[PDB]
Symmetry: D2
Subunit: 418 residues, 4 copies
C-alpha cells in the first residue's frame, strides 16, 4: 500500500504525459507539506491569538507590508508574532519586511531607507524589496541594511517589464525572487504574467535560489470561506511550476477567513507536491546544473541521488547558516530535508527553501566534537520520529562535515532508523 500513496504510480511513469494520466485523487499524500506559506499580517491577523491559529494551520513566514502602518504598528506585529511563536516553545516562523518602494525613480525612497533601518533594529529575517529593476537596486538595499543586517536575506520583487528583462542580473546578486504578480500584471499585459512567472521560477530553480509566487492566489477567500476553482488551480500550479513559497496578502491581512486560507494553501500544496514528476525534474536539474568543485554541492547531489534510490524518509543535515540545506533543496528530493541548526535566524530563514524543516538545537556543545555531531543527528532522528517524518525501519541520509564551522559539509551517510 506504500506504493499506492503520494502519487507513486504517477511518479514511476515513463513520460510526463503518462505521469499526468496516472494522477489519482485516491492516492493520499503522506509526506510533510514542503512549500512554505507566507501570510501577510494585518487587522485580520495581528492578534497573538489569531497568529497562534495561523501557526498551527501552517504559516511559516510572516510578511509585514510597509506600504501601510507606522513603525509602531509593525513593531507590535513583530512582537505578537514572536510571542505566538514562543507560546509553542514548536515552529520557527520568519519575519519578512516588504518595502513600500517607489510609488526612473531611485532604487530606494527616503522612506524605504528608514523602514529598512527599523527592520534591522528589530531583527527581521527577510526583506522583500519592491520594484527591483537592476542589480544596483539590490546593492542599494544591501547598503541601507548596512553592517548589522548582513545576514538578512534579500528577495527581489520583480514587478515590471524592466525587472523581467534584467532578471539574470537581478537574480545573480539577490538571495531570491518574488514574482510580484499584482503590479506585474498592471505593468505588462495581464495575459502575459504566467510566462514571466514560469520563466522566473524555472530560472530560480536552476540557480538553486528561493522563488515566491505572490498575490491573489486565493483572493475570494477575503470574503468567502471557500476558494474558486481557478484559485485552487493557481496554488497547485505554482507548486508544480517550482515555487519554494506561496503567499497570502489580503486573505490573511484583512479578510474574514485568514486561518482557513492558510489551511487551504497547506492542503493544496501537499497534494501538488506529491504530484511533482521528480524523475524528469531531478534529471533536468542535473544535466543543466554545472560541474562544481564545491564539496557541499558535490555532497548534496550525491545525497539526493542516494535518497531517491532507497525511498528515504528524510535527509538530516547539520547546518549553521542554512546553506547545506538550500543545496539539498535545489534538487527537490521527495525526502524531507531536516536541517538541525544552532542558529535561530537560520532556522527561520530556511523556510525560504522548499522542503526544509528546521530543528533548533539548544543543547550546550559536547566536549568531543564528534560526540556533538552525533547528538545533533540523534536530536534529528528523535524529533523526526515524534513529528511523523520517520519510522523505525526507515532509511535516512545524514549529511555532515569533517570539521566544525560553516563551509565544510562533505560527508554523506546512509542510516536505518531503529
Amino acid at each position: 500500500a506504500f506504493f499506492q500513496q503520494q502519487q507513486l504510480p504517477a511518479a514511476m511513469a515513463d513520460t510526463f504525459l503518462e505521469h499526468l494520466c496516472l494522477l489519482d485523487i485516491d492516492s493520499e499524500p503522506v509526506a510533510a507539506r514542503s512549500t512554505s506559506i507566507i501570510a501577510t499580517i494585518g487587522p485580520a491577523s495581528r492578534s497573538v491569538e489569531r497568529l497562534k491559529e495561523m501557526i498551527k494551520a501552517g504559516m511559516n513566514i510572516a510578511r509585514l507590508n510597509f506600504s501601510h502602518g507606522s513603525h509602531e504598528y509593525h513593531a507590535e506585529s513583530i512582537a505578537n508574532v514572536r510571542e505566538a511563536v514562543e507560546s509553542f516553545a514548536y515552529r520557527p516562523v520568519a519575519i519578512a519586511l516588504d518595502t513600500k518602494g517607489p510609488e526612473d525613480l531611485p532604487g530606494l525612497s527616503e522612506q524605504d531607507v528608514r523602514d529598512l533601518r527599523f527592520g534591522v533594529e528589530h531583527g527581521v529575517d527577510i526583506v522583500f524589496a519592491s520594484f527591483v529593476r537592476k542589480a544596483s537596486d539590490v546593492a542599494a538595499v544591501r547598503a541601507a541594511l548596512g553592517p548589522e543586517g548582513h545576514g538578512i536575506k534579500i528577495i527581489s520583487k520583480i514587478e515590471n517589464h524592466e525587472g523581467v528583462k534584467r532578471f539574470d542580473e537581478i537574480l545573480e546578486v539577490s538571495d531570491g525572487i518574488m514574482v510580484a504578480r499584482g503590479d506585474l500584471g498592471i505593468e505588462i499585459p495581464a495575459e502575459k504574467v504566467f510566462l514571466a512567472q514560469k520563466m522566473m521560477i524555472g530560472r530560480c530553480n536552476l540557480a538553486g535560489k528561493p522563488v515566491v509566487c505572490a498575490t491573489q492566489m486565493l483572493e475570494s477567500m477575503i470574503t468567502k470561506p471557500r476558494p474558486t476553482r481557478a484559485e485552487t488551480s493557481d496554488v497547485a500550479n505554482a507548486v508544480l511550476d517550482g515555487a519554494d513559497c506561496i503567499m497570502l496578502s489580503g486573505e490573511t491581512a484583512k479578510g474574514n477567513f485568514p486561518v482557513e486560507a492558510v489551511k487551504m494553501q497547506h492542503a493544496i500544496a501537499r497534494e501538488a507536491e506529491a504530484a511533482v514528476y521528480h524523475r524528469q525534474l531531478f534529471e533536468e536539474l542535473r544535466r543543466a546544473a554545472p560541474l562544481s568543485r564545491d564539496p557541499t554541492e558535490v555532497t548534496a547531489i550525491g545525497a539526493v541521488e542516494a535518497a531517491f534510490k532507497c525511498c528515504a524518509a528524510a535527509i538530516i543535515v547539520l547546518t549553521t547558516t542554512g546553506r547545506s540545506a538550500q543545496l539539498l533543496s535545489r534538487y527537490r528530493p521527495r525526502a524531507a530535508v531536516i536541517a538541525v541548526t544552532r542558529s535561530a535566524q537560520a532556522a527561520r530563514q530556511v523556510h525560504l527553501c522548499r522542503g526544509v524543516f528546521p530543528l533548533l538545537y539548544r543543547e550546550p556543545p559536547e566536549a568531543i566534537w564528534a560526540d556533538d555531531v552525533n547528538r545533533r543527528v540523534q536530536f534529528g532522528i528523535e524529533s523526526g520520529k515524534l513529528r511523523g517524518f520517520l519510522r523505525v525501519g526507515d532509511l535516512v541520509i545524514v549529511v555532515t562535515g569533517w570539521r566544525p564551522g560553516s563551509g565544510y559539509t562533505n560527508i554523506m551517510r546512509v542510516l536505518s532508523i531503529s
Copy 2:
C-alpha cells in the same frame, strides 16, 4: 536561411526560442513576455448564454471577441427561454463566415424525465452538442444517446465528470463519449476541492491520448462577473488549462449574468493565444507518438505525417478536406502549431469541430464540380483564399494539404507553396 523566407522576427515570435529548448526546464527558462504570439488562437471558447448575453447585438460582439460555442444551461429557464437563446445566437451569426456551435447542458439530478424532454427539445432545435450532467458510467451516456433518438444521431455527446464515480470510471465513460467536460464546480464539492487539479490534469491527459475533445469548465474568470479585469489566479487558471491540454475553455456566470461578458471572452482569447504559443511541442508530439498505437487507418497515418511535415517547414496551415470533421480531429490530436483549416460542406460538422483545438472550419457552399478532382482543388483554393483573407496565410507561405483519393478515405498529403 529561413530568416530570408519567413522574416527576421519570425523566430523571435511565437516563443520559438523556448520551443527549440532541449529540456522542459530550459523551455520554461526561455519563455519570453516580448515574444508576440503570431498564430491564430486555437483553444475554443464556450460562453454560457443568459441575461447578460442574449441580445443579438451582444452576441455579435461576443462572436467578434472569439466565442465559438454558445452553452445553454437547462438547469434554469423554460424551453421557450432557450428556444429564444438559440434563435438569437443564430441571428447574430447570420447577421454578419464564423460558425458558432450550440450546446445543450442538461439539468441532470438536482437521466430524469425532465432531461429526456430537454434532449428531445434539443434535437427539435438542431443543437450540435450535449453536455450531459453527472455521467457516472458508460450506461449513463447510452441513456443519453437513446433519448436523442434516431434524429439526433449526429449530435456530439460530451460527458460531464462531476463526482468521484465519474472520475473512477473515467475510462469506460471516455470510450463511449465524444468528449469530456472537467466540470469543476460540482466536482470541487463532490471531492475535496484541493484534489480537483489532479482530476483535471489526468482527464485532459487521457483525453489528449485518446484524441477526444476535453473542456475545462467553471470559475475560470469568476471575478469578471463584477470586475472589468480578472485576478492573477484566474489568468493563471486559463493559461494552465491550455497548457494542460484542454481543447476548450468555458465561461459560465461571467457571460450568462455578469457585467463584462464581452471583456471575459476577450480575456480568454488573449490568455489562450499566449498559452498556446508556450506549448512545448517537441516533448508533447514525441510523447503522443510513443504512446499512441500503430495504426493501419490511412487517415490517421496521413495526419501524423502531415503534422510532422508542418513542423519541418513551419507550415502556416494544414488545409484538410473533411466531411464529418474526423480528418481534422486526427490532425488536431497531434497539436500542430500550424492552423488546421478544415473545409467542409456540412454546416453541422463545421460547427461541431470547434470542439477540437486548432481547427478553423470553413463551410463551402458550391455545387460539386463535374470532375471530382476539380471539386477537390476548388475547395482547396477556397481554403487558401479564406486563409489569406483571415490573416492565416500570405503569399510565399508553405501549407500542407490533406485530401482523399476516393469520395472516410483521407490519405494524401501535399506540400504546397502559396501563390
Copy 3:
C-alpha cells in the same frame, strides 16, 4: 510477425534495454539494405565470377586504379556490364583513383578522363584533404562528367580535421581505414570512423566503411570473430556501404566474402534501434522549406506509424530517394526511375532498391505516374517486398521534371 527482425528490441524504451532484447532467434525479413562494394581483381574479373557475385549481393564494383592499365580496367568495366546484362540488379561502377603516392596527379587526370569516357557512375577520390581537392576532381571530370558522384576518401589527419569542409562539397565520404590507420595511430581509427559516419548521417550523405572488414577470407573460407563484429558494427554505426578489397580482388573466396557481408548486414540492419535513431535525426536535422525534404520526413514518419512494407518513390536523379534514406526507414525505399545511371547511383544510399522503368511515356502524364507506381508495386510483389494487404507510402510530384516531389499518399496493396 513480432518475433522477427528484432521487433521486441525495436520496441524497447531505452538503448540499454533494446540491447538486452536482441534475439539470435529473431530472423531478419526485410531485404538487406546496406550496399556491398566489391573490388574487382584477378579473383573477380571474369564474367562468370561477376555473375556469382551479383547473385550473392554485390551492388557496386570498384576499379582500383592503383594497379592495371586503362585496357585492363576497360575489360573490367565491360565484364561487369555483360554480367549485369545477363540478368535484374543494376550494379554501379566506381573508379577509385591512384592519388598521391598535390591534389590530382597527371595520372589521376587521365584516369578520370577514362572513367568519364567509359560512363563510370562514382569516383572514390584518394587522399582528400580539403574542399579544393574535391573541386579539382570535379573540374577534371569536366562537363560530360557532371552527373558522376564524388565520394571523398578521408585517409589522413588533415582530412579528418577538415572533414566538414570536405563533406560540404562532396557527394559522400569513404572512411579509408587502410591509410588512415597508418597516418594516425591505429587505436584511434574507430573514433574517426564513428565521427565521420555520424556526421554523414546527419547531413544525409552516403558514407562507406572500407578496408580489412573480412580480411582473413582472402585465404580462409570463414571470417574471424572480430571481422563479423566489424561488419555488423559498421552497419550499426550508420554506414550506407561496406566494402571488400583483397577479399574480392585477389583472395580465394570472393563470392563467399560478398555472401558473408550480405548475411551480417541483414542481421545488423534488423538490430538498428530506429526509435532512438529517427528521433535523433529528426531533432538534429534543420527546418527546411524544400518540398522534397518536407515530404520525405512526413513520408518516413507515416511509414513508421503503419509498419509500412515500402515507400515507393518516383525519382529522376535519385535525390528524392536519398532524402527518404537519410531518415533510415525500416520500410524499403523502392526508387522507380527512367535513368539507368540514377538506378546505379542510388546504391550509395542505405535501403534504396532501384527499378529501371523502360516503358514509353504515356500521353497523359498523370497516367504515366500511375503506371510507374503500379510498376513499383508489381515488382515489389514479385521480388518479396510487398504482400497483398501491406501498406505502402507513395511519393511523387506535382509536375514533370526533378525537383518537384511534394506528394505523399498512403495506399493499401491488393
Copy 4:
C-alpha cells in the same frame, strides 16, 4: 582539460551528436579500466616474458586446460606468481576448463577443478555452460575449499544463449566465448548474442568477458587489422569488463605487442563512452535498493561526475563495494583498498577497479585503521599517477568493521 578524454562528446545532448563530437586529438587521460586477459602458452610462459606482459597491462592470466598436463599448468601458475613477486601488481589466475571437447562436467574437468583449488586459482571459466545445474556441478567440484573461487560461465552454444538469464543468476559473471559460439550458431548472429549478454550483465552488475580472435592476425603480424582494432573498441563500447587474448599471447610471435595494443585501444574507447546516456539508463532500470552499500555507491558515482573526481577510493574486504561502484561506470578510477590478496586479484574482473593490497597490522583504534587505508589509497594513486595535489576524490567506507559500506566523503587531495 576539457579538450581531453572526449569531454566535448561527453556533454552532447544526443548519442548521434556524441558520435559527431568524437575527436582523434582528444587524448585519453584516465587509467585504462577494462581488464586484459592473456592466455598462457609457449609464447608467454617465461618469467621474463610474463613480466613484460604485466608492464604492458595483463591483469589476468588464463590457463587453458584443453592442452597441457597438470604439471604443465602448475609451472604456468609458478611463473606468473614469480613474475608478480619479482617486482604492486596483482595478477589474477583463471582456469579455463576443457569441457566437452573433441580433438584431432567430465571426470577430467573435476580433476582439473580440484587441481585448481589445490593451486589457489582465483577464477574458473566454465566451458559450455548450458543451464544453471551445470554451474552447480562446478561449484560442487570446487568443494568447500573452493568457495571463494569466482565462476565465470562460458556461453558457447544456442542452449546457453537461450537459458542465459538462469545461467547469469547463478554465476559470478559471463564469458562471451565467440570461438565456439560462432560455430554453434551462425557466425553472422554472434554480435547479437554478444551485445545482449554484455547488456544483461551490465544491468545485473556482473562482469562480462569478450573473447576470441580480437587481434587474431597479431599471432603472425606486428600490427592488427582494421576490423580487429574495431572489435576491441566496440567490445569496450558495448560494455565489456574484460577483453581477452588467446593464440595472440599463447602461441604467436607478438604477445607483448598484442597486450599493448589492447591497452591502447581500450584506453581510447573508454574515454568515448557516452556516460550521460549509460549512467541515466542504468539508473532507470536498476531497482530501488534498500542496501546501504548500493545506495552509497550510486551517490558516490553521481558525486564523482559532479566534480570530475579523479578517483573513488573504496575500502573493501571481498571486492563487493568496488563492484557496486564499477557497475555505474564512473569515469573516475575506483581505487579499491583491501587486505585480501585474493579479493584484490579477483576485482580485476570488474571494469575500472584498481586494487591495492594493504599489508599492515590493524591500528589500535578502528577509525584510525580506516584513515590509514584511505591515506594508503591516496599515496598509491599519487605515485601511480591517479591523483595530483588539489584533485577531488570520493571516499567510500563503512560505519562498523567486517557488508556495511555506507559512507561517502568528498576530499581534496593535499
